[PDB]
Ligand binder design. Structure first.
Ligand SMILES: [Zn+2]
Lengths: 577, 233
């Protein structure tokens, strides 16, 4: 009977391995699921018995091949495999000699210390459940289990890496019922995988020196090329943090060469050149990366990728998609003052996002970045600085066309804090104004500035009373953004009274801007210039004293670039006059 | 359907994406949004589907997510809600579209996917926003959001042309409980010069068994007693 079950186990293992080596995406998974149903039915058949001595190492060979091919197909460990381990463990316990896995393991390893000749399968089962606790991040009691497996007097060694190094595989795995993978293949995997995970965790928490050691350990040994790439990139990140530029670059180049997936290398490159201040090379790295990301097998076995965690945002291995990076490029291009180029990139970004019907989807920037109206606004700001104001009007008008239905009906306009309007709407009138200024139209400019000013005071944007949508969480709520934008539009207006020759009205707007943001100093330059023109002495000195009484946090980017744009270079010189 | 006894058994050659844990799935133009039960947390996926007449393939997965809110007989339900200007689903009108899914969805002119789950709560996910990778994993708390928490399982989601006064620019959103909480939503822009949502939790009798939508705000549903009918128009 056990000959037939064992021949069946050997048949399904052979079937799973044929499927792994050969086949296409369907036929592979078809034979794999056929083998999976086979091992499930065989496990039920074997559990049909009360688990005596000769069924045990067969039941465990089946259980191992089952959790292996389960997690390789499901593409992740979970708790069903742990409960099947518990089942096999109760089968070991009730044969020879309940509460929880730790004490259960201690008692089963106590029974193995009696040495029944199935320790080759017990250590493999420990390997699989250790893999489970590792991918589930249950690191503490895993150390306890392996410390109980190895000698107990090595218990002061709390660090896991030495514990996995001391943990031997038990046997050469003699002619037992056949298995898909040996405990040595698990040993090498568990070492590199935990070393990687530990290295990255220590990296995020600001030990990019200690990380180097762990990663070299993870590099030396079983290391599949994809992770060797991610490791090298992490080494580039560690070097960039310490300071050492040239080793950093060396790691990055090596990573590019070995890699077929060289995004995160070039992102780290860019963050390096940013540290060095080689702005042109920085931009060139990102420029390259975009063309790079333009380009877009699961073996029935337990590999490292299954154990490696999905990466976070702090990681150097977080690399968004083509679109989130073309937006990084354009953001850094606008941050630098290459606005002609920045305009081209932003029109390529919006082309990606709105000419997206047919091809594979290109997503908008992630939520921690800008929402989609702030992408149109930064686009308009860029084209304004490029001297292309007649296009920044067709941009803003298209933004207010598509969201008309959202905009308020301005019947409150007659009734004149309570009603609601998000900042990006006000901001569009502000930019649509400054656009008319550059084309030289005083009247419609002061008109548009005034309309922006109205929306900022006769409505509140932070009305998160009724959660009606995917509202803008952060960019279009910040009170710092509101007060700086108020001040911005007041200034942008005041100068148009000056250009037209209505200096008293200009004075009123600059005064209000001073009342709103007294720690901006752009306000003061304009105010003191006006008072020095008309009535210099007393008020000028009175506002000097206000400044010296006074003497950026998280603004959106379209507002930062608008303020940096309008402000005059000779500010502090005049502020020292 | 050409497909060159009158019974014909299907060979597993016809199988495509045998994910073997997938609970529900729907289709949009060039895409095959599915929804697959993992362990406790259910996860939405999103695939290509090759536009030219080839081997009928899925393609490689564009995106996934994790419906973190759902922690488990009743299959869930999916509905596509593309807007006008951009398909088996329902096209809403722009004012409503903007009320429910916001500026992001309006501007990208992105289809939206409403999943009612057996839990009851009914979550939406924007597709254009749902592109992810092993270097870029889909963030649930950002990417999937939750209109309304019906207490009871979900049977049908639809949309209706109230005010009728194929591509009908629907105006009304309907959800339907097992135990008969109906819920309807429509756009107002009332009382303050602001767009507001119209919630109604109606309460029909019965265990509801199925639902559909007919011309002009009528909703044919079927209690255990008889095929009944409701008008919103
Ligand atoms: Zn915003």
């Amino acid at each position: 009977c056990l000959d037939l079950w064992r021949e069946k186990n050997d048949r399904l293992v052979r079937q799973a391995k044929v499927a792994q080596n050969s086949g296409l995406t369907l036929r592979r998974q078809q034979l794999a699921q056929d083998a999976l149903e086979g091992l499930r039915g065989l496990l039920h058949s074997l559990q049909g018995l009360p688990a005596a001595v000769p069924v045990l190492p067969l039941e465990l060979t089946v259980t191992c091949n089952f959790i292996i091919l389960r997690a390789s197909l499901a593409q992740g460990f979970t708790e069903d495999q742990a409960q099947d381990i518990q089942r096999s463990l109760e089968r070991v316990l009730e044969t020879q000699e309940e509460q929880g896995l730790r004490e259960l393991w201690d008692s089963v390893l106590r029974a193995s210390c009696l040495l029944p000749e199935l320790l080759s399968a017990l250590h493999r089962l420990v390997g699989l459940q250790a893999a489970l606790w590792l991918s589930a991040d249950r690191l503490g009691d895993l150390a306890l289990l392996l410390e109980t497996l190895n000698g107990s007097q090595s218990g002061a060694s709390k660090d896991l890496l030495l514990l996995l190094k001391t943990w031997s595989p038990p046997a050469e795995e003699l002619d037992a019922p056949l298995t898909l993978q040996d405990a040595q293949g698990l040993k090498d995997v568990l070492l590199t995988a935990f070393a990687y995970r530990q290295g990255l965790q220590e990296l995020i928490t600001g030990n990019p020196d200690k990380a180097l050691s762990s990663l070299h350990e993870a590099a030396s040994g079983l290391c599949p090329r994809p992770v060797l790439v991610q490791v090298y990139t992490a080494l580039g990140s560690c070097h960039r943090k310490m300071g050492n530029p040239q080793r950093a670059l060396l790691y990055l180049v090596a990573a590019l060469k070995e890699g077929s997936a060289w995004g995160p290398p070039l992102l780290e490159a860019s963050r390096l050149y940013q540290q060095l201040g080689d702005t042109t090379a920085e931009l060139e790295s990102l420029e390259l990366l975009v063309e790079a990301l333009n380009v877009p097998a699961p073996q029935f076995l337990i590999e490292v990728e299954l154990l490696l965690p999905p990466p976070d945002l702090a990681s150097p291995l977080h690399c968004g998609t083509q679109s989130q990076t073309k937006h990084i490029l354009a953001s850094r291009c606008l941050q630098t003052g290459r606005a002609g180029d920045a305009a081209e990139h932003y029109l390529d970004l919006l082309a990606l996002l709105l000419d997206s019907s047919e091809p594979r989807f290109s997503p908008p920037p992630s939520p921690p970045g800008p929402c989609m109206p702030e992408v149109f606004l930064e686009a308009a700001v860029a084209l304004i600085q490029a001297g292309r104001a007649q296009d920044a009007l067709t941009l803003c008008e298209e933004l207010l066309s598509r969201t008309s239905s959202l905009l308020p009906k301005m019947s409150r306009l007659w009734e004149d804090e309570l009603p609601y309007c998000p900042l990006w709407v006000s901001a569009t009138h502000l930019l649509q104004g400054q656009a008319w200024v550059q084309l030289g139209a005083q009247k419609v400019a002061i008109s548009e500035f005034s309309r922006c000013l109205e929306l900022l005071f006769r409505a509140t944007p932070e009305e998160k009373e009724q959660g009606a949508a995917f509202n803008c969480e952060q960019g279009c709520k910040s009170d710092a953004a509101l007060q700086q934008l108020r001040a911005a539009a007041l200034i942008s207006r005041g100068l148009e009274w000056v250009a037209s020759g209505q200096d008293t009205k200009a004075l009123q707007d600059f005064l209000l801007s001073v009342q709103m943001c007294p720690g901006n100093r752009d306000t003061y330059f304009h105010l003191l210039q006006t008072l020095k023109r008309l009535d210099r002495r007393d008020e000028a000195t009175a506002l000097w004293w206000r400044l010296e009484a006074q003497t950026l946090w998280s603004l959106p980017l379209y507002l930062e670039s608008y303020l940096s744009w309008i402000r005059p270079s000779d500010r502090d010189a005049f502020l020292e006059e | 359907l050409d497909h060159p006894s009158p019974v014909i058994p299907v060979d597993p050659d016809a199988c495509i994406l045998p994910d073997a844990a997938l609970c529900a799935f729907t289709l949009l133009d060039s895409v095959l949004v599915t929804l697959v039960q993992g362990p406790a947390r259910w996860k939405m996926q999103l695939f290509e589907q090759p536009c030219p007449g080839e081997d009928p393939r899925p393609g490689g997965q564009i995106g996934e997510v994790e419906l973190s809110s759902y922690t488990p007989h009743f299959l869930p339900v999916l509905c596509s809600v593309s807007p006008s200007g951009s398909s088996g689903g329902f096209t809403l009108e722009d004012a409503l579209f903007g009320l429910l899914f916001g500026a992001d969805a309006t501007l990208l002119q992105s289809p939206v996917v409403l999943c009612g789950l057996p839990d009851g709560q009914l979550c939406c996910v924007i597709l254009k926003a749902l592109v992810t990778s092993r270097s870029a994993p889909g963030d649930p708390n950002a990417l999937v959001k939750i209109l309304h928490h019906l207490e009871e399982p979900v049977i049908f989601i639809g949309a209706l042309k109230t005010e009728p006064q194929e591509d009908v620019h629907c105006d009304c959103l309907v959800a339907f409980g097992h135990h008969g909480r109906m819920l309807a939503i429509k756009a107002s822009w009332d009382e303050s010069g602001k767009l507001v949502p119209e919630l109604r939790e109606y309460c029909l009798p019965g265990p509801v068994l199925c639902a559909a939508c007919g011309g002009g705000g009528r909703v044919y549903h079927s209690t255990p007693s008889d095929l009944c009918v409701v008008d919103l128009s």
